[PDB]
Amino acid sequence: GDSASQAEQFLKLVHADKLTVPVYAQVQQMLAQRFAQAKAPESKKAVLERYQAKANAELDRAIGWDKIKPELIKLYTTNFTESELKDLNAFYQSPLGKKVLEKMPRLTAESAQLTQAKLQGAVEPVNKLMADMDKELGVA
Amino acid sequence: GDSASQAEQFLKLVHADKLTVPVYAQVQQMLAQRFAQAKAPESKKAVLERYQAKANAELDRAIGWDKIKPELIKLYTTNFTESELKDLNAFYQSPLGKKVLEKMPRLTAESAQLTQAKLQGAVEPVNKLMADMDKELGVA
Ligand SMILES: [Cl-]
Ligand SMILES: [Cl-]
């Protein structure tokens, strides 16, 4: 019924269209890295300009929002009811919903930096640990 | 004020304690892989049992929930008000909140498999594209 419209509104509110940005950036940085890698005359950077446009168009063919959007709507309409999607929209339309969306990438990154920093403390003991098992079983 | 209690309830509802499970699994699979790698007498698997317990205890020292929990509460209480955290708890306590929490890992995985599958279609054209730029600039 009116589920697809609510699913579409959800993907907009959640900025699911920007999920591909890392792929477009990686291919753009790869070309400039390939341009530098050999020769690199800054007088011919307009040649890199068209090859970066070509790569952008080729990604748009495979992973453009118009290709992704239909299959994500099927994903949400099959997993949620029209009423559930409407309520998800009400939450993400709300000031708190918008606050969660902006904070989440940074909160996730800060949360992961914290754990990775702490985990480095277990590197030396786990290295010693495996070395002791290899010693005990008679290895090297 | 009563923010820390609400932050603690949030981390419980969201299962932030299970965020470390991949690290514990990787270190457990690494020891069994190291056990197989050289010799491997199944009569001495009780030796791997204690080394896997040792590794579990060493990770608990660095990245145990008791070490992670205090710094995540500071993260949420500084980024959200007590009232905002209370409302986040109301949403994730609700049947729809619980449905979102269960669906999200699978919806994220399915969403990423879809994009990666489509992206493989742009592999050959982007490879040809870079090869043509290397050809045009006079490389190999
Ligand atoms: Cl609100
Ligand atoms: Cl509900």
Side-chain angles (χ1 to χ4, degrees), chain A residues 1-28 30-36 38 40-41 43-133 135-140, chain B residues 1-28 30-36 38 40-41 43-133 135-140:
Chain A
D2 216 53
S3 296
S5 182
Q6 296 278 22
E8 173 181 74
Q9 186 54 37
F10 181 72
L11 297 166
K12 286 176 186 198
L13 299 166
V14 149
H15 308 269
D17 51 290
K18 327 244 164 53
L19 254 60
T20 58
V21 184
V23 184
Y24 282 81
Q26 207 184 306
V27 180
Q28 189 107 324
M30 207 167 289
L31 278 157
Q33 249 274 18
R34 179 106 176 209
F35 190 80
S43 60
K44 275 193 163 184
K45 256 203 170 189
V47 167
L48 180 78
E49 275 191 77
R50 78 179 209 259
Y51 275 97
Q52 282 188 336
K54 277 189 93 208
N56 178 268
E58 290 285 5
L59 289 180
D60 286 337
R61 194 204 170 165
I63 61 143
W65 180 238
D66 50 295
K67 319 293 192 319
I68 307 308
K69 186 181 177 151
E71 293 188 66
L72 284 180
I73 288 162
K74 282 159 196 172
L75 188 82
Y76 280 87
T77 59
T78 67
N79 276 281
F80 297 88
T81 75
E82 180 187 321
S83 74
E84 278 163 353
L85 292 166
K86 170 197 121 149
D87 292 349
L88 285 182
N89 286 348
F91 183 78
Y92 297 107
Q93 266 155 8
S94 82
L96 179 53
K98 270 142 182 186
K99 196 190 193 210
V100 172
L101 299 172
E102 158 86 317
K103 301 273 201 199
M104 283 309 178
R106 199 186 39 86
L107 294 186
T108 299
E110 265 161 53
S111 170
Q113 280 162 226
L114 155 82
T115 306
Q116 192 71 53
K118 280 182 186 287
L119 185 61
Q120 292 307 121
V123 170
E124 199 186 300
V126 168
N127 281 350
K128 158 94 153 72
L129 162 103
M130 285 166 76
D132 286 341
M133 196 182 65
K135 274 179 186 188
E136 211 163 273
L137 301 162
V139 191
Chain B
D2 216 53
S3 296
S5 182
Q6 296 278 22
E8 173 181 74
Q9 186 54 37
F10 181 72
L11 297 166
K12 286 176 186 198
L13 299 166
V14 149
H15 308 269
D17 51 290
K18 327 244 164 53
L19 254 60
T20 58
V21 184
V23 184
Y24 282 81
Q26 207 184 306
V27 180
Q28 189 107 324
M30 207 167 289
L31 278 157
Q33 249 274 18
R34 179 106 176 209
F35 190 80
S43 60
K44 275 193 163 184
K45 256 203 170 189
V47 167
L48 180 78
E49 275 191 77
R50 78 179 209 259
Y51 275 97
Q52 282 188 336
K54 277 189 93 208
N56 178 268
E58 290 285 5
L59 289 180
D60 286 337
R61 194 204 170 165
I63 61 143
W65 180 238
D66 50 295
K67 319 293 192 319
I68 307 308
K69 186 181 177 151
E71 293 188 66
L72 284 180
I73 288 162
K74 282 159 196 172
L75 188 82
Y76 280 87
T77 59
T78 67
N79 276 281
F80 297 88
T81 75
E82 180 187 321
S83 74
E84 278 163 353
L85 292 166
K86 170 197 121 149
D87 292 349
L88 285 182
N89 286 348
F91 183 78
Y92 297 107
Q93 266 155 8
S94 82
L96 179 53
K98 270 142 182 186
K99 196 190 193 210
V100 172
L101 299 172
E102 158 86 317
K103 301 273 201 199
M104 283 309 178
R106 199 186 39 86
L107 294 186
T108 299
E110 265 161 53
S111 170
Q113 280 162 226
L114 155 82
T115 306
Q116 192 71 53
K118 280 182 186 287
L119 185 61
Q120 292 307 121
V123 170
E124 199 186 300
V126 168
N127 281 350
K128 158 94 153 72
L129 162 103
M130 285 166 76
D132 286 341
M133 196 182 65
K135 274 179 186 188
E136 211 163 273
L137 301 162
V139 191

